[PDB]
Amino acid sequence: GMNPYERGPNPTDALLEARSGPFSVSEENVSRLSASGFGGGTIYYPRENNTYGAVAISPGYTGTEASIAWLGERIASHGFVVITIDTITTLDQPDSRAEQLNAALNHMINRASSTVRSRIDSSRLAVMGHAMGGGGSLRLASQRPDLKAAIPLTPWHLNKNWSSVTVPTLIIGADLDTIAPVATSAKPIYNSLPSSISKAYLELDGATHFAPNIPNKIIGKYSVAWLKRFVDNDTRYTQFLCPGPRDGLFGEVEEYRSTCPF
């Protein structure tokens, strides 16, 4: 098609809500010893002979790669090369996690096997992270306006003012989070982002701080729609983001805000 970055079948709610997307995925192990500037991890990549955008995902404080593994694989299965990382130590702070997200992106582009490197369009990169890892994704986005998307999940950073970020950013909050409360963290972060960038706020209903650490159909669906729209420029996914998920009785979320139209 006209957009050279479109991958996969035309989307539906059911296809985005499924446990796995349409792309067969393989894994490349990144040992802690092979990793420069992060703690190792796993690269999930589509076996099909396309090039895809690449995504690095960081866990949060005391969290391991296993706390975010499901989301990396799910996203990769919709047509992305995704690394889920361990950090250098489990106690690393958000700004350290930002440096490690950068190191993880660089590893995929420079240090992985030719099998992985040949499937990456190194010009189309995104970052994600849970909690302090979401704070890391915000810091790195602020330093790297070349990134195509950022998805901070139940994020925390010391700094809530990310008005300098121009990367399309989807903030995911959890209404029952007591560890990084949306009242003091996710919502101040989201409202700091400029009106003039592509951004959205998605607050999960009945959700704790740890909602991102188990398979979650809503997180999977809208993370994939966000990356599709902004890493792939794929306007087939605009309809999922704008006006976006409904709230209330038959809805998907507690609250959704956006700078739609995209």
Residue numbers in the entry: 40 to 301
Paper text:
Cutinase is an esterase that belongs to the α/β-hydrolase superfamily and primarily hydrolyzes cutin from plants. Unlike lipases, cutinases lack the active site-covering lid structure such that the substrate-binding cleft is exposed and directly accessible from bulk solution. In addition, the substrate-binding site is more expansive in cutinases compared to esterases, benefiting the binding of bulkier macromolecules. In this work, we investigate the PBAT hydrolysis potency of cutinases and PET-degrading enzymes, and find that cutinases outcompete other reported enzymes.
We further constructed the inactive variant S170A to obtain a complex structure of BTa but failed to obtain any dataset that contains additional electron density that can be modeled with the ligand. We thus turned to a BTa-like compound MHET, which is composed of TPA and ethylene glycol linked via an ester bond. As a result, the structure of the S170A variant was determined in apo- and MHET-bound forms to 2.21 and 1.82 Å resolutions, respectively. In the MHET-bound complex, the omit map clearly indicates the location of MHET in the active site. Notably, the ethylene glycol portion of the bound MHET was located outwards and away from the catalytic center, opposing the direction of those in other MHET complexes (see below). Nevertheless, the hydroxyl group of S170 is estimated at 2.9 Å from the carbonyl carbon of MHET, which is within range for nucleophilic attack. Therefore, the complex structure should present the substrate-binding mode of TfCut-DM. The residues that ineract with MHET, Y100, M171, W195, and I218, are conserved in IsPETase and LCC-ICCG, while I218 has an alternative residue in LCC-ICCG. Superimposing the MHET-bound complex of IsPETase and TfCut-DM indicates that the ligand binding modes are similar. In both complexes, the TPA residue of MHET is bound to the TPA-interacting Trp (W195 in TfCut-DM) that adopts B-type conformation via a T-stacking force.
